[PDB]
Amino acid sequence: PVRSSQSSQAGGR
Amino acid sequence: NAEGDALSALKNSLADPNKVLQSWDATLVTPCTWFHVTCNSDNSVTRVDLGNANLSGQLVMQLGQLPNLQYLELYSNNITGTIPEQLGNLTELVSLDLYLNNLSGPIPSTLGRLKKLRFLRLNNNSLSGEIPRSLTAVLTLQVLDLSNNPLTGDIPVNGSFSLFTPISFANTKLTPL
Amino acid sequence: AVSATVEEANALLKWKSTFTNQTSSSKLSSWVNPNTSSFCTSWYGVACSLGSIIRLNLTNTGIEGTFEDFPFSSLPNLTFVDLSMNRFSGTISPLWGRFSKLEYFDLSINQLVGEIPPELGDLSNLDTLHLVENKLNGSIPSEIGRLTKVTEIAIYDNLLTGPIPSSFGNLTKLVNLYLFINSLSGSIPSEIGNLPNLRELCLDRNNLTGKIPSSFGNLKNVTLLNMFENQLSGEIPPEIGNMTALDTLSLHTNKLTGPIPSTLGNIKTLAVLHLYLNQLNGSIPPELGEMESMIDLEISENKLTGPVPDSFGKLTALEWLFLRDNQLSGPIPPGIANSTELTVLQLDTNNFTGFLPDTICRGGKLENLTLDDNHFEGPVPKSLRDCKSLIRVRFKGNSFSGDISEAFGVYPTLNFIDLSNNNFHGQLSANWEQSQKLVAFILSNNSITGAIPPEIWNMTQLSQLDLSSNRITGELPESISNINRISKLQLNGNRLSGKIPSGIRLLTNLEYLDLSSNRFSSEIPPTLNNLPRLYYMNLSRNDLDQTIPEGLTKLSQLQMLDLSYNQLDGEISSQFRSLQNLERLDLSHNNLSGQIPPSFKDMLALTHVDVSHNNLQGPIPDNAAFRNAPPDAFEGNKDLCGSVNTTQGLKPCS
Ligand SMILES: *[C@@H]1O[C@H](CO)[C@@H](O[C@@H]2O[C@H](CO)[C@@H](O[C@@H]3O[C@H](CO[C@H]4O[C@H](CO)[C@@H](O)[C@H](O)[C@@H]4O)[C@@H](O)[C@H](O[C@H]4O[C@H](CO)[C@@H](O)[C@H](O)[C@@H]4O)[C@@H]3O)[C@H](O)[C@H]2NC(C)=O)[C@H](O)[C@H]1NC(C)=O
Ligand SMILES: *[C@@H]1O[C@H](CO)[C@@H](O[C@@H]2O[C@H](CO)[C@@H](O[C@@H]3O[C@H](CO)[C@@H](O)[C@H](O)[C@@H]3O)[C@H](O)[C@H]2NC(C)=O)[C@H](O)[C@H]1NC(C)=O
Ligand SMILES: *[C@@H]1O[C@H](CO)[C@@H](O[C@@H]2O[C@H](CO)[C@@H](O)[C@H](O)[C@H]2NC(C)=O)[C@H](O)[C@H]1NC(C)=O
Ligand SMILES: *[C@@H]1O[C@H](CO)[C@@H](O[C@@H]2O[C@H](CO)[C@@H](O)[C@H](O)[C@H]2NC(C)=O)[C@H](O)[C@H]1NC(C)=O
Ligand SMILES: *[C@@H]1O[C@H](CO)[C@@H](O[C@@H]2O[C@H](CO)[C@@H](O)[C@H](O)[C@H]2NC(C)=O)[C@H](O)[C@H]1NC(C)=O
Ligand SMILES: *[C@@H]1O[C@H](CO)[C@@H](O[C@@H]2O[C@H](CO)[C@@H](O)[C@H](O)[C@H]2NC(C)=O)[C@H](O)[C@H]1NC(C)=O
Ligand SMILES: *[C@@H]1O[C@H](CO)[C@@H](O[C@@H]2O[C@H](CO)[C@@H](O)[C@H](O)[C@H]2NC(C)=O)[C@H](O)[C@H]1NC(C)=O
Ligand SMILES: *[C@@H]1O[C@H](CO)[C@@H](O[C@@H]2O[C@H](CO)[C@@H](O)[C@H](O)[C@H]2NC(C)=O)[C@H](O)[C@H]1NC(C)=O
Ligand SMILES: *[C@@H]1O[C@H](CO)[C@@H](O[C@@H]2O[C@H](CO)[C@@H](O)[C@H](O)[C@H]2NC(C)=O)[C@H](O)[C@H]1NC(C)=O
Ligand SMILES: *[C@@H]1O[C@H](CO)[C@@H](O[C@@H]2O[C@H](CO)[C@@H](O)[C@H](O)[C@H]2NC(C)=O)[C@H](O)[C@H]1NC(C)=O
Ligand SMILES: *[C@@H]1O[C@H](CO)[C@@H](O[C@@H]2O[C@H](CO)[C@@H](O)[C@H](O)[C@H]2NC(C)=O)[C@H](O)[C@H]1NC(C)=O
Ligand SMILES: *[C@@H]1O[C@H](CO)[C@@H](O[C@@H]2O[C@H](CO)[C@@H](O)[C@H](O)[C@H]2NC(C)=O)[C@H](O)[C@H]1NC(C)=O
Ligand SMILES: *[C@@H]1O[C@H](CO)[C@@H](O)[C@H](O)[C@H]1NC(C)=O
Ligand SMILES: *[C@@H]1O[C@H](CO)[C@@H](O)[C@H](O)[C@H]1NC(C)=O
Ligand SMILES: *[C@@H]1O[C@H](CO)[C@@H](O)[C@H](O)[C@H]1NC(C)=O
Ligand SMILES: *[C@@H]1O[C@H](CO)[C@@H](O)[C@H](O)[C@H]1NC(C)=O
Ligand SMILES: *[C@@H]1O[C@H](CO)[C@@H](O)[C@H](O)[C@H]1NC(C)=O
Ligand SMILES: *[C@@H]1O[C@H](CO)[C@@H](O)[C@H](O)[C@H]1NC(C)=O
Ligand SMILES: *[C@@H]1O[C@H](CO)[C@@H](O)[C@H](O)[C@H]1NC(C)=O
Ligand SMILES: *[C@@H]1O[C@H](CO)[C@@H](O)[C@H](O)[C@H]1NC(C)=O
């Protein structure tokens, strides 16, 4: 199947 | 970042029943609060020591985008495969410990790009090739030791390989001397 | 039709007989004798209307082949084509454009390479176009703009290059446009902003450049907008505030500049906002507090300045808040942590000052909290003492104060805390015993006094202990053997005393051992020889005693050794040859006596040695380190003779 993209999250410290 | 992603790729390519890569979290900004990994004074990995930790698997080519890594320790484990060529991109590297494994294939010739290298330990494996002889181009090379795997054909005696002893290259089917 | 199915099925068998490895997938084997309509009822992946082929569905069936012998000239009634998840290879033939009633066209995951032929523009009735997960290259023809009824374009994860065609402005019925993971380039055409029906537009992971077209104010029903990891520039147009149906705007890892526009406060439905890793500057607009349905907010790694507004008190649903790596300054408002269900707070690498508010863990659900490198001060709040969900906590580099045994409590699920470089004083408590899955405990450089509770050793999941540069007292017991997972133990800069416990020898994962600047006074444990991973050990500036045990020379993986500023005695043994990795040896300021052994002409790793201010005598060995040792490592000794080239204040050897 074809899907939207997904944004990751900013790195923590 | 980039060092973190290279180390995460390394983690995905291995198996560990002892859980020694448990803390390697790819969610943080930098891999400096991980265990067995030490960073520089300005957030750059300089040692990756993971030896005698009972790992099983294959190396990857991403290991070559750790631009400032100085020490690489993976000896006394159960890794199978061949040594990548991208290890020639670790321009500032002092020691390479990779022995007591099940590595196969030939020794890459790109290892001649590493000018500051001082320790090579590849011994006690199953590697087959010709000792590319570009290693005589590093000239720092305090100690080299590979003495259990078949590298048949010649022991070069260029300017570098002139202070070594037969105790290296032993039992390796070389016999040029 | 029924009479034409003769030719149709004959061509189909001729095409099928061109595959390879068909034996495993006996599913396609059901194609048998073409006769009076039996194949319609029994042939897999085939449907006929009025006796003619309509649909070709061959998902995930293991086929192998090419499209060389596909009957383009025999199938005038094919309308549905789906051939996803196979191993078809070759190229895409232009004849594919001659199906007059084609509606659904899928050529997903396959081996397909080559270009995208322009003649696909003739597909007047095409509705959905999928060319995902292939190795297509070249460009995107402008003739795509002639498909006036398509409603879904998916061409992502191919090797495309070149610009976005402007004729996309006439694709007046698009809904979903996915172009991610390709190598596009150029600038976004402005006419893309004039589509009256887009709801999902993905352009992330490309090389687009230029500025965002302000015409994006005309997208009145978009619900998602991804453009991260590109090379955009300029400033975020204020008209971006009229996309009033958004709920996820992400533009991170770009080259944008300027201030964040206040108009983002007009989008009621926005729930995710990613803007980190850019070059924005200015101050936080107070209007950013008027987004009542906001769940995630990440503005890390930028060039913002000024104070944090109080209006963040109105964000009731916040769960993630990323403000780290900026140049914000001032005090911290009480409204920053007002929300009940906050779970992550990342405020480090800024210039805040003052006191923490009294609403840090009001809802009792916080998990992650970082405050490194600021100028906070005072005591820790009391609502943070009873916050029973912490996992990772970082307080490093600040000026908090108070009593260490009163500041904290019991945390069942903690596994990382770092409280270094602060002003806590007191004695360690026994509450830390009840964090059973804690892994790291770093508490260096504070004002803590007292003794280490025995309960500190109940912890068996521990892997790093750091209680350095403090005023701890007491003696180390034997139950120190219980931890046994530890790999980095740092206890220097304290006032520990007594013997070195022998139980240390039961530690096997030990890598880094720092036991220095204390008042230990007793023989080094003669049984330390079972550390097959240790590479660093520093036992300097102590009150140690009788001769170094030779067991220390079975520490095979040793690279740095520092037995300096002590009361050692006797002679250095010859077993130091076995150390084949050691490259630093600090051995000065003792009563070491005798002669330095000659067998040290065997370890080639030595670079730095120091045996100054001892009672040594005799010739130095033939090593590069002794060859190249400055004068400052040989004074104070009795009879150290040297060679003419290596003349550093020493008497010439006889
Ligand atoms: C507060 O901060 C803590 C710590 O920073 C966060 O806790 C961590 O959360 C992450 C979630 O991402 C946990 O991640 C773990 O690693 C794997 C992640 O999977 C992805 O990445 C790997 C590596 O590239 C890929 O192979 C994989 O396909 C994914 O792309 C997961 O697989 C882990 O699941 C495992 O659970 C246990 C682990 O022993 C086992 O059952 C299995 O191995 C299983 O696979 C897991 O998700 C990480 O472990 C957490 N650390 C902790 C809890 O100490 C919190 O999330 C954060 N709080 C908030 C609100 O964000
Ligand atoms: C083992 O640990 C000890 C102490 O933890 C280390 O001692 C440190 O040695 C360095 C160099 O000998 C000292 O640096 C010097 O600091 C003085 C302070 O003014 C300065 O004048 C000098 O110019 C030099 O910079 C350092 O201060 C000293 N640490 C302490 C706390 O005094 C020792 O180096 C460690 N061993 C190894 C091998 O790392
Ligand atoms: C790995 O190294 C060990 C020693 O460090 C090898 O052990 C010896 O190997 C030689 C090789 O011919 C044998 O003749 C000896 O009998 C071995 N010693 C013992 C005690 O068994 C070991 O063989 C090496 N690995 C491999 C696969 O050869
Ligand atoms: C090491 O010895 C070898 C054997 O003579 C040298 O080999 C050639 O050297 C020339 C330069 O004079 C190079 O252009 C060739 O590529 C080398 N070929 C091979 C097969 O080695 C080599 O130059 C010597 N030095 C080094 C650093 O390898
Ligand atoms: C996409 O990749 C293919 C394969 O490398 C390229 O095919 C070559 O194209 C050139 C001119 O376009 C021809 O002269 C060659 O004969 C082709 N090679 C083969 C093996 O057929 C194609 O050019 C690439 N796309 C673009 C736009 O360059
Ligand atoms: C409709 O799509 C066409 C496809 O290219 C666009 O291009 C041409 O625009 C000129 C300007 O009037 C006209 O000749 C035709 O509308 C198009 N020509 C051809 C051959 O298609 C056109 O701009 C699009 N219209 C709108 C309003 O966007
Ligand atoms: C955003 O998209 C929706 C999709 O449905 C549009 O709603 C349709 O609008 C047309 C007129 O352009 C009507 O004929 C349909 O009946 C509407 N359908 C639904 C389900 O509402 C909406 O108009 C678009 N936004 C704008 C500003 O036109
Ligand atoms: C966002 O949309 C609003 C509503 O249409 C725009 O406000 C109107 O803009 C037009 C065109 O500039 C003006 O003619 C009207 O007088 C404006 N009306 C009001 C009440 O402001 C607005 O310009 C758009 N862009 C931004 C950044 O808000
Ligand atoms: C934020 O960055 C912008 C972009 O450089 C700065 O605005 C520029 O300031 C210089 C200073 O004279 C002007 O020459 C430019 O014309 C300005 N650019 C624009 C687009 O207006 C702005 O000064 C920066 N803000 C801070 C606080 O440093
Ligand atoms: C901070 O504390 C709470 C957290 O949600 C909120 O206080 C509410 O504020 C509204 C608006 O004035 C009142 O109607 C509620 O009665 C308040 N509730 C409570 C429990 O005090 C708000 O987010 C912040 N406080 C204020 C006064 O704005
Ligand atoms: C350990 O803590 C002490 C006490 O805070 C640090 O010494 C102070 O450092 C600050 C800089 O942050 C100076 O402004 C003070 O003047 C220093 N005071 C004293 C008495 O030295 C010390 O730097 C910390 N150790 C480390 C390694 O950072
Ligand atoms: C952690 O706690 C348990 C429970 O008290 C300890 O078990 C007892 O510990 C005391 C001293 O710590 C011993 O004197 C007892 O003999 C232990 N009981 C049993 C049945 O073994 C456990 O030893 C503690 N672990 C430490 C301190 O490392
Ligand atoms: C090393 O890994 C291989 C993986 O196939 C396994 O078969 C072998 O038993 C392992 N060796 C040891 C000593 O664990
Ligand atoms: C080493 O790096 C260069 C440039 O980053 C690139 O050629 C490649 O990644 C590496 N070299 C080889 C031969 O793989
Ligand atoms: C497709 O169907 C139409 C309408 O029934 C018919 O005219 C045409 O001949 C069919 N195509 C064939 C049988 O190849
Ligand atoms: C059949 O065998 C494999 C797949 O099973 C693959 O090489 C290819 O599909 C076929 N072989 C050849 C030589 O084409
Ligand atoms: C084809 O069959 C699959 C099941 O194998 C089904 O999921 C799909 O909806 C069908 N139609 C198309 C066009 O793929
Ligand atoms: C953008 O182009 C450069 C060079 O042309 C290339 O190295 C880079 O990978 C491209 N980016 C993407 C996302 O394709
Ligand atoms: C705090 O502000 C000063 C100048 O006022 C700046 O030099 C420093 O880098 C800032 N601290 C940060 C950004 O952590
Ligand atoms: C060395 O020994 C002498 C006597 O042998 C003693 O007086 C002196 O205090 C000792 N110094 C050290 C540093 O051990």
SS3 B125: coil
Domain boundaries, given as residue ranges, for chain C: 546-654
Query: What does the CA dihedral C501, C507, C512, C516 come to, rounded to 10 degrees?
Result: 0
Distance from CA of B134 to the nearest CA of C (A): 22
DSSP state of B88: G
Q: What is the DSSP letter of C455?
A: G
Q: Quick one: three-class SS letters along C181-217?
A: CCCCEECCCHHHHHCCCCCEEECCCCEEEECCCHHHH
List residues bridging with C464 in a β-sheet: C440, C488
What is the Cα–Cα distance from C426 to C37, expressed in whole angstroms? 91
**Cα of C347 vs its chain's centroid, Å:** 18
* Residue from C104, C85, C208 nearest C151 by CA: C104
- Contact present, C222 and C250 (Cβ < 8 Å): no
Q: Do C300 and A10 touch (CB under 8 A)?
A: yes
The atom number, within ligand 16, closest to the CA of C64 reads 9
Q: Residues of C with CB below 8 A from A2's CB?
A: 108, 130, 132, 154, 178
Concatenated DSSP letters of C586-652: E--SSEEEEE--GGGSS-TT--EEE--SSEEEEEPPS-HHHHT--GGGSTT-SEEEB-STT-SSPPB
Please answer whether residues C628 and C606 qualify as being in contact, where contact means their C-beta atoms are separated by less than 8 angstroms. no
| Angle, vertex CA C507, rays to CA C505 and CA C513, nearest 5 | 90
Question: What is the whole-number distance in angstroms between the Cα of residue C205 and the centre of ligand 7?
Answer: 30
Cβ–Cβ below 8 Å for A7 and C320: no
Q: Please indicate whether, in this complex, the C-beta atoms of C248 and A13 are within 8 angstroms of each other.
A: no
Going by C-beta distance under 8 Å and a sequence separation of 6 or more, which residues neighbour residue B42? none
Whether the CB-CB separation of B8 and B37 falls below 8 Å is answered with: no
DSSP H or E segment with residue C241: none
* The token pair that represents C483 in the structure block: 């931890």
Long-range contacts (CB closer than 8 Å, 24 or more residues apart) made by B25-32: B27/A9, B27/A11, B27/A12, B28/A11, B28/A12, B28/A13, B28/B4, B29/A10, B29/A11, B29/A12, B29/A13, B29/B1, B29/B4, B30/A11, B30/A13, B30/B1, B30/B3, B30/B4, B31/B3, B31/B4, B31/B7
The backbone torsions φ and ψ at residue C323, rounded to the nearest 5 degrees and listed phi first, read -120, 15
Do B52 and C533 count as a contact with CB atoms less than 8 A apart? yes
For B31-83, the DSSP string reads TTSSTTEEE-TTS-EEEEE-TTS--EE---GGGGG-TT--EEE--SSEEEEE-
Angle value at C-alpha C485, between C480 and C489, nearest 5 degrees:
60
Which of C215, C219, C239 to mutate for ligand 8's pocket (most ligand atoms within 8 Å of CB)?
A: C239
* Any atom of ligand 13 within 6 Å of the Cβ of B78: yes
Q: Give the C-alpha separation, C310 to C327, whole Å.
A: 17
Method underlying the structure: cryo-EM
Q: Rounded to an integer, what distance in angstroms lies between the CA atom of residue C214 and that of residue C93?
A: 39
- Please give the backbone phi and psi of residue B88, each rounded to the nearest 5 degrees, phi first: -75, -5
Backbone angles phi, psi at B14, to 5 degrees: -130, 170
Q: Write down all domains in chain B, each with its CATH number in brackets.
A: 2-145 (3.80.10.10)
Cβ contacts of C489 on chain B, cutoff 8 Å: none
Size of interface B-C (CB pairs under 8 A): 22
Residues C1/C52, Cβ–Cβ less than 8 Å: yes
Structure tokens at C186: 């150029």
SS3 state of residue C44: coil
- Distance of alpha carbon B83 from alpha carbon B70, whole angstroms: 18
Tell whether B43 lies on the interface with A, counting CB pairs under 8 A. Answer: no
Q: Which ligand neighbours the alpha carbon of C339 most closely?
A: 10
What is the edge-to-edge ordering of all strands in the sheet holding B102-104?
B14-15, B56-57, B78-82, B102-104
Q: How far apart, in whole angstroms, are the C-alpha atoms of residue B116 and residue B175? A: 29
| CA max distance for chain A | 35
Instruction: Give me ligand 1 centre to Cα C419, in Å.
Output: 24
∠ at Cα C524 (C519, C525), nearest 5°? Answer: 125
> Could you give the CA distance from residue C187 to residue C348 in angstroms, rounded to a whole number?
36
What is the rounded distance in angstroms from the CA atom of residue C185 to the CA atom of residue C203? 11
**In angstroms, what separates the C-alpha of A10 from chain C's closest C-alpha?**
7
Which is nearest to C566 in space by CA: C548, C586, C583, C590? C590
Give the Å distance between the CA of B150 and the centre of ligand 10: 76
User: Is residue B37 marked as binding?
Assistant: yes
Report chain B residues whose CB lies below 8 A from the CB of C535. Answer: 49
Instruction: Write the CB contacts of C496 (distance below 8 Å, at least 6 apart in sequence).
Output: C472, C473, C474, C475, C476, C518, C519, C520
Nearest to B37, CA basis, from B49, B28, B29: B49
Q: Which ligand is nearest to the CA of B91?
A: 14
Q: With contact defined as beta carbons under 8 Å apart, do B39 and B31 qualify?
A: yes
Q: State which amino acid sits at residue C13.
A: L
CA distance B23 to C145: 51
The CATH code of the domain at C546-654 is 3.80.10.10
- Binding site membership of B85 for ligand 14 (Cβ less than 6 Å): yes
Select the residue of B35, B119, B143 nearest C464 (Cβ to Cβ). B35
What resolution in angstrom units was achieved for this structure? 3.3
Cα–Cα distance, C607 to C585 (Å, whole number): 9
Residue C89 corresponds to which amino acid?
S
For strands C320-322 and C272-274, give the pairing.
unpaired
Contact (CB<8Å) B143/C605 = yes
Q: C329 pairs with which residues across the strands?
A: C351
Distances (CA, A) of B42 to B30, B45, B46, B165, C293: 11, 9, 11, 41, 39
Tell me if B111 sits within 8 A of B90, measured CB to CB: no
CB C75 within 8 A of CB C51: no
Residue B15 CB neighbour total at 10 angstroms: 11
C neighbour chains, 3+ CB pairs within 8 Å? A, B
Q: For residue B34, say whether it is annotated as part of any ligand binding site.
A: yes
Enumerate the residues of chain C whose CB falls inside 8 A of the CB of residue B141.
none
3-class SS of residue C393: strand
- Scanning the structure block, which residue is given the tokens 């059901």? C30
